[PDB]
């Protein structure tokens, strides 16, 4: 929501159980259509922000005391990095959160 984009981690379930796949909806860039995450088509900063947020989402459910991220605050366009820092601030606003 802070990025001003709509996205959901959907689990598409065809008739075959092994054919079930994961879809990620992308809206951070209007030009980029809704597609699976990939480095070549999308920009580096938006992809990094998306994958960092996906990591953050799978933290409260996990019982790990904390999560470690390296080479993350290195600049992503100074805009996507700013919004991911804002997301990190918002997550840190909640109490009993993992230390990064």
């Amino acid at each position: 929501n802070n990025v001003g984009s709509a996205g959901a981690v959907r689990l598409e379930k065809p008739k075959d159980y092994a054919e079930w796949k994961i879809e990620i909806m992308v809206k951070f860039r209007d030009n980029a259509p809704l597609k699976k995450l990939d480095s070549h088509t999308q920009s580096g900063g938006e992809r990094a922000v998306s994958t960092v947020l996906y990591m953050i989402a799978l933290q409260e459910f996990t019982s790990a005391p904390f999560r470690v991220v390296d080479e993350i605050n290195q600049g992503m366009d100074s805009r996507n990095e700013r919004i991911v820092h804002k997301a990190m601030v918002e997550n840190a606003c909640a109490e009993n959160t993992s230390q990064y």
């Binding site: 480095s39 070549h40 580096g44 290195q74 600049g75 366009d77």
Partner: protein, 527 residues
């Protein structure tokens, strides 16, 4: 120097540009026609308009700067991965050549026209206008701040540019816009330097068809822009401290500012020699590289790659491009006043020299080493190549021999006698001679070090001949004694050639110095 830097008769300097040249009626009409054709996506007739009057007339048809940017973007639409799009745009290939190839050829031909001002071949106004257009394109191609990983301003009010309403040519974003992103200029440089030596067909095609020629053109244009900036944009007389500040704003300073990283010396040394034969020291982190324009790393089904380049060809071209990058770096550095150092780029000549010497002396393949040190024009690369040669020689002597003899050969290029005396001192010290502490098992690495040493000394000797000629090789007994000491080192190496550790003969540089200035082995065969 030349007229390209000191011809400002027709300029009308403005706040944004000092090279600005007003348009005349014929050139205004040509600009309008070219932009009108480019609006209709009729790039074929744009190229035909430029080519049909190239070399057939005294007067010159000047390419507008925005058309130059369009050609830069067109040069990225290589056939091997954009064949369907190019065929769709031009179903009747009347020129029997790709749009990318024609645009690139026009860019290189006009760069060649610009690099020398033939006032007799072309009138001065057209040449100055062409320089202004190229400089405007370069100023529009200013790199963004380096990232680890404003829209369009038209100076001419007489016509509406084609780039005002668009940002893509044939599905490829404009080259300036793509490179005016935080981590794309360094990405492009690393991509082309890595793929210059790839054996993968798509990567090598991406480097060989798109990015090495474009990088050549961009480096040449930035060098010309740097010369013009130093000639005019600075305030001539200066307190030697404001000049450093102005140099920090120079086009090459901004060019290399996107390459500062954390430590410029070592990271730059790795960047220039990326994917070379040298062993990576201190486990440096791998540099991520990605294709610049979507599927550069794929080959479309319709295109069939039917060209093969020998490894020597690829290595030669890659090392020449690397030399051009290093030469631009040194061209920026050598203007820095002594004592002072640049503010924005944290770059020092000694640091870069030492880093390049460390990377060169770590080469395990002699072919790339020689390709780096073999240049077709000695005068062009004269201002940094001897420094790299002497530095690599010093480092090789340091690692091979515990006693590092200080080398003063660069300033000894002024006096041949001093150079020959220093060569005699090094060879008598046995540092240049083949070293006895090296074991039989490690004979191959010692041979590699010696042959690199010989290459460095040969480079310095060619530069000495370039600066003094052949006048007192025998007239001065010092040069004769230098030749006899070369023969002494010949005998020293021949000692182990007869020791028969390996059948391969060790590197002996007596025949080469004989061919250059040894007077064909002195009097061994002459008399």
């Amino acid at each position: 120097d030349g007229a390209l830097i000191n011809s400002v008769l027709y300029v009308s300097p403005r706040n944004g540009a000092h090279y600005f040249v007003e348009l005349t009626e014929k050139h205004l009409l040509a600009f309008e026609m070219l932009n009108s054709m480019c609006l209709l996506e009729n790039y074929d007739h744009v190229l035909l308009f430029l080519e049909c009057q190239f070399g057939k007339s005294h007067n010159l048809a000047v390419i507008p700067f925005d058309i130059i940017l369009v050609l830069f973007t067109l040069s990225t639409l290589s056939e091997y991965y954009k064949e369907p799009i190019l065929r769709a745009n031009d179903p009747y290939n009347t020129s029997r050549e790709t749009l990318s190839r024609r645009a690139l050829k026009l860019l290189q031909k006009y760069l060649a026209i610009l690099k020398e001002f033939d006032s007799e071949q072309y009138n001065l106004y057209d040449l100055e206008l062409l320089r202004c257009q190229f400089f405007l394109a370069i100023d529009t191609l200013t790199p963004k701040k380096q990232k680890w990983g404003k829209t369009f301003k038209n100076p001419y009010r007489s016509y509406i540019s084609c780039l005002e309403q668009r940002n893509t040519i044939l599905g490829n974003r404009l080259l300036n816009l793509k490179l005016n992103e935080p981590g794309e200029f360094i990405n492009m440089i690393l991509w082309t330097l890595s793929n210059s030596l790839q054996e993968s067909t798509p990567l090598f095609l991406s480097s060989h068809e798109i990015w090495m020629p474009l990088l050549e053109i961009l480096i040449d244009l930035f060098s010309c822009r740097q010369d013009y900036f130093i000639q005019h944009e600075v305030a001539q007389n200066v307190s030697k401290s404001l000049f450093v500040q102005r140099l920090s704003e120079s086009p090459l300073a901004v060019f290399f500012e996107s390459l500062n990283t954390r430590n410029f010396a070592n990271r730059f040394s790795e960047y220039v020699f990326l994917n070379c034969d040298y062993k990576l020291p201190s486990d440096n982190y791998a540099t991520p590289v990605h294709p610049v324009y979507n599927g550069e790393n794929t080959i479309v089904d319709t295109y069939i790659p039917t060209i093969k380049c020998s490894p020597l060809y690829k290595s030669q071209k890659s090392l020449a491009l690397r030399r051009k990058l290093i030469g631009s770096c040194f061209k920026l550095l050598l203007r820095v006043p002594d004592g002072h150092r640049l503010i924005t780029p944290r770059i020092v000549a000694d640091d870069v020299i030492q880093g390049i010497s460390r990377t060169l002396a770590s080469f395990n393949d002699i072919l790339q080493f020689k390709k780096f040190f073999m240049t077709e024009n000695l005068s062009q690369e004269s201002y940094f190549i001897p420094l790299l040669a002497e530095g690599t020689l010093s480092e090789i002597l340091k690692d091979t021999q515990e006693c590092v003899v200080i080398l003063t050969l660069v300033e000894n290029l002024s006096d041949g006698v001093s150079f020959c005396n220093e060569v005699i001192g090094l060879v008598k010290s046995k540092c240049f001679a083949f070293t006895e502490q090296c074991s039989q098992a490690s004979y191959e690495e010692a041979v590699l070090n010696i042959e690199k040493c010989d290459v460095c000394l040969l480079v310095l000797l060619r530069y000495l001949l370039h600066l003094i000629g052949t006048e007192a090789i025998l007239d001065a007994k010092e040069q004769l004694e230098m030749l006899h000491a070369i023969e002494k080192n010949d005998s020293g190496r021949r000692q182990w050639a007869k020791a028969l550790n390996l059948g391969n003969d060790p590197p002996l540089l007596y025949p080469i110095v004989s061919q250059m200035f040894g007077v064909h082995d002195k009097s061994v065969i002459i008399e």
